[PDB]
């Protein structure tokens, strides 16, 4: 799922860049002709707004963690069996050691 969102964001960014290039070409043509104070066509403006909204949707979905405020639910499935043993004090005197000695 995240890969699809990343691809959609990339496609939206590419569409935005293409709309930018089209607007730049429009302004370059406008500089050619005297007067004719007209705005850029509305179709490209709608396309760039569509690219603005599409990339704005996946940018929220990419980084969603929203971890729970309560910390009692994170030590909830953990049992006391694993907590009893500690990495610090570790005695290497067990029957399994001499059981596994020969293979």
């Amino acid at each position: 799922a995240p890969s699809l969102w990343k691809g959609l964001v990339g496609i939206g960014l590419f569409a935005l860049a293409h709309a930018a290039f089209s607007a730049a070409q429009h302004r370059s043509y406008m500089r050619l002709t005297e007067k004719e104070d007209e705005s850029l066509p509305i179709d490209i403006v709608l396309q760039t707004l569509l690219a603005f909204a599409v990339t704005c949707y996946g940018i929220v979905h990419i980084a969603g963690e929203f971890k729970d405020m309560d910390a009692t639910s994170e030590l909830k499935n953990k049992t006391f069996d694993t907590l009893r043993n500690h990495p610090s004090f570790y005695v290497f005197n067990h029957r399994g050691r001499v059981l596994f000695r020969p293979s």
């Binding site: 089209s22 043509y29 050619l32 066509p41 490209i44």
Partner: protein, 50 residues
Amino acid sequence: SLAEVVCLEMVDLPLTGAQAELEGEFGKKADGLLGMFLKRLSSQLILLQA
């Protein structure tokens, strides 16, 4: 015959080929959204070829 000058003026050049081509390509009288999109695609293809 270029010593005594009475009146003088300056004029500009007509146009440039690529600039004139762009000006002609942009010229639209009455068209729909599909037509402008097709014209934009054609212009992009021409730019890619260039």
